Amino acid sequence: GLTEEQRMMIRELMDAQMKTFDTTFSHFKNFRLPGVLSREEAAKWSQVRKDLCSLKVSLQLRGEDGSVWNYKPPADSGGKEIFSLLPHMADMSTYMFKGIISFAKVISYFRDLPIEDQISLLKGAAFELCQLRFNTVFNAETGTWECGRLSYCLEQQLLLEPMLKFHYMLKKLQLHEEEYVLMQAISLFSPDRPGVLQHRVVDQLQEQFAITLKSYIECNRPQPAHRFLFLKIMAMLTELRSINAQHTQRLLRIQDIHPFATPLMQELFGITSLTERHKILHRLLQE
Ligand SMILES: CCOP(=O)(OCC)C(=Cc1cc(C(C)(C)C)c(O)c(C(C)(C)C)c1)P(=O)(OCC)OCC
């Protein structure tokens, strides 16, 4: 069994998740959609083409009336068309990041951290928590993220893109709500995010959540078979941290030739004292 302390830790994370995770995406509205339409710079485009060609999805929008709009992205031709779903993606991700910021704020341990640590933790973990929330609505039989009335369907080769292989693998583990939120807490409270000051306090908080997840697993799962689930999960978090760095770099390359990030993404991801360079995040954190 878990200590009362560990049960309380889980309760608070579960509370936080239920209050901030719009699982049916019923409040995701007013987003943009794809419309009805040099030596060194080429090197930039060529990396960008690679950065994107692997992550293509068609988009489906189910209307309340039973109607269906389906969008199939264009093949990579000359150039620009490759960025067609980016403004919509920016909107979905920004929407997701806002729920991630609210999640963090409801957690006492996060709130007790100095504001500048809260900012640094949110910048380092944002993409990771968003992807962890996305895995819970990912349908691995169809290669589709089911987002309420919206759906994103991936257009042996997939398993080659680290983030796609990550969704498949994570999904296979058949985690409980509790395990997903403990994964989120562990990712959130990473002592080694750049610019974190209270390294020791964050490191200890992270070990607490990891121990709770470890005990949760010992106690809630048939022994022998789930003997290494915790470590499998820790390995997935290590790989996710690396995918985060990789994807942040792609984001910056695309932004360089085709600025498109929302103002909140610009703050989260280092796009153009710590509180002055992060006023949106700061305002979201203090309300
Ligand atoms: C670092 C910021 O990353 P980012 O939030 O930026 C959104 C504009 C981002 C988000 C993202 C990534 C994936 C993959 C990787 C699993 C395919 C998704 O499937 C989805 C949806 C919404 C369709 C579920 C969103 P990116 O990894 O994928 C964009 C297609 O962007 C990388 C630049």
Q: Is 97 in the pocket of ligand 1 (CB under 6 A)?
A: no
152 lines ligand 1 (CB under 6 A): yes
Per the entry, the structure determination technique was X-ray
Ligand 1 pocket, 184 CB below 6 A? Answer: no
How far is it, in rounded angstroms, from Cα 212 to Cα 156?
35
Distance CA 187, CA 51 (A): 24
250 pocket-lining for ligand 1 (C-beta < 6 Å): yes
Q: Whose CA is nearest to atom 26 of ligand 1?
A: 247
b/e per residue 180-203 (b: at least 16 CB within 10 A) = bbbbbbbbbbbbebeebebeebbe
Ligand 1: distance of its center to the CA of 251 in Å?
9
Burial of residue 219 (CB within 10 Å: 0-12, 13-18, 19+) is exposed
Three-state SS letters, the chain: CCCHHHHHHHHHHHHHHHHHCCCCCCCCCCCCCCCCCCCHHHHHHHHHHHHHHCCCEEEEEECCCCCEEEECCCCCCCCHHHHCCHHHHHHHHHHHHHHHHHHHHHCHHHHCCCHHHHHHHHHHHHHHHHHHHHHCCEECCCCEEEECCEEEEECCCHHHCHHHHHHHHHHHCCCCHHHHHHHHHHHHCCCCCCCCCCHHHHHHHHHHHHHHHHHHHHHHCCCHHHCCHHHHHHHHHHHHHHHHHHHHHHHHHHHHHCCCCCHHHHHHCCCCCCCCCCHHHHHHHCC
Instruction: Give the domains, in start order, of the chain with CATH numbers.
Output: 1-287 (1.10.565.10)
Is the CA virtual torsion 284, 137, 203, 235 positive or negative?
Answer: negative
In sequence order, which residues have a C-beta less than 8 Å from that of residue 171 and are 6 or more positions away?
135, 138, 140
Number of CB atoms found within 10 A of residue 74's CB: 12
Angle at which helices 199-220 and 229-257 cross, to 10° = 130
Q: At 49, which amino acid appears?
A: R
Handedness of CA 41, 266, 200, 15 (dihedral sign): negative
- CA distances from residue 88 to 58, 59, 108, 129, 175 in whole angstroms, order as listed: 12, 10, 33, 19, 29
Query: What is the C-alpha to C-alpha distance for residues 237 and 121, in angstroms, rounded to an integer?
Result: 15
Residue where the block lists tokens 């589709």: 144
Token readout for 254 is 């695309």
Among residues 108, 81, 229, which one has the least CA distance to residue 169? Answer: 229
* Count of all residues that appear for the chain in the document: 287
Resolution (A): 2.1
Residue 53 token pair: 């060609």
| Angle at the Cα of 125 from the Cα atoms of 127 and 80, rounded to 5 degrees | 25
Query: How many CA atoms within 13 Å lie on the side-chain side of 113?
Result: 29
Q: CA distances (Å), 242 to each of 191, 203, 206, in order?
A: 15, 19, 18
Q: What is the C-alpha to C-alpha distance for residues 152 and 146, in angstroms, rounded to an integer? A: 7
Q: How far is CA 12 from CA 19, 216, 219, 254, in A?
A: 11, 15, 19, 38
Give the whole-angstrom CA distance, residue 69 versus residue 64: 12
Q: Nearest 5°: CA angle at 48, between 100 and 132?
A: 25
The whole-angstrom separation of Cα 287 and Cα 285 is 6
Question: Roughly how many angstroms between the first and final C-alpha of the chain, as a whole number?
Answer: 37
Rounded Cα gap, residues 178 and 9, in angstroms: 10
| Of residues 125, 256, 98, the one with CA closest to residue 193 | 125
**Angle at 144 (CA atoms; ends 54, 178), nearest 5 degrees:** 110
Amino acid residing at 236: M
94 touches 264 (CB < 8 A): yes
Residue 113 CB contacts under 8 Å (≥ 6 apart), including other chains:
121, 198, 201, 202
Q: What is the largest CA-CA distance in the chain?
A: 64
- Measure 68 CA to ligand 1 centroid, in angstroms: 23
**Among 247, 252, 270, residue whose Cα is nearest residue 54:** 247
Beta bridge partners of 203: none
Spatial distance between the Cα atoms of 253 and 51, rounded to a whole number of angstroms: 9
- Residue 1's contacts (CB-CB under 8 Å, 6 or more residues apart) are 219
Q: Which atom of ligand 1 is nearest to the CA of 244?
A: 1
Please work out whether the CB of residue 55 comes within 6 Å of at least one atom of ligand 1.
Answer: yes
In this structure, are residues 285 and 72 in contact, taking their beta carbons and an 8 Å threshold? no
Using CA atoms, how far apart are residues 23 and 36, in angstroms rounded to an integer?
A: 30
Please indicate whether residue 240, judged by its CB atom, sits closer than 6 Å to ligand 1: no
